[PDB]
């Protein structure tokens, strides 16, 4: 059914996650701006 | 009708569907076809009579649908399974041959031939 084998290359996906955080923050400001006229 | 003859054999010398590899890509002949002459490139050839299909490795030659529905195929030598590993060793020798010299063209043909054999 299921088994677990850790795949340690999530630290190879560091610029992807960093980009996600930046856009997350920027979308906070965008959401606040869109909730304004 | 198909007439396939070689300088040392006579094979198919009608035939239902025939697939031939030519300098024009691949050509298939079924019944009347336009009565072209096309030069056959070094090849893997299939000849089908009914649904039964027989596979030939063909050294290239010339193909000519005749305007009477006779597919004249002539080529230097051939079944496919018989040609089939040592030749893969031979290509390594041939790669060496490209290095030294007319031999380049020869070796280039050899690269084509191993590639074509590996392909099937």
């Amino acid at each position: 059914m299921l088994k677990r084998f850790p795949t340690p290359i999530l630290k190879v996906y560091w610029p992807f996650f960093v980009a996600g955080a930046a856009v997350y923050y920027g979308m906070s400001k965008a959401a606040d701006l869109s909730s304004n006229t | 009708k198909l007439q396939f003859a070689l300088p040392h054999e006579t094979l198919y010398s009608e035939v239902t569907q025939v697939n031939l590899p030519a300098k024009s890509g691949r050509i298939g002949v079924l019944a009347n076809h336009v009565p072209t002459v096309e030069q056959l490139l070094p090849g893997v050839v299939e000849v089908m009579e009914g649904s039964n299909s027989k596979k030939f490795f063909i050294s290239g030659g010339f193909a000519t649908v005749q305007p009477d529905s006779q597919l004249c195929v002539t080529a230097i030598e051939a079944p496919l399974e018989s040609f089939s590993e040592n030749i893969k060793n031979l290509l390594a020798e041939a790669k060496k041959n490209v290095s030294s010299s007319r031999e380049a063209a020869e070796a280039a043909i050899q690269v084509e031939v191993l590639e074509n054999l590996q392909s099937v």
Partner: protein, 48 residues
Amino acid sequence: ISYAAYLNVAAQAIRSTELQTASVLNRSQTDAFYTQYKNASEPTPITK
């Protein structure tokens, strides 16, 4: 490299798998000397 020479080298390669009969191998063997001539005079004979 003539068109038939092009085919020739391909044919020679095709006799390479090792299961092949002696007559095949014999068809790949050859022995000839093209002796050039001119005018009478004979430029030297050399194997094909």
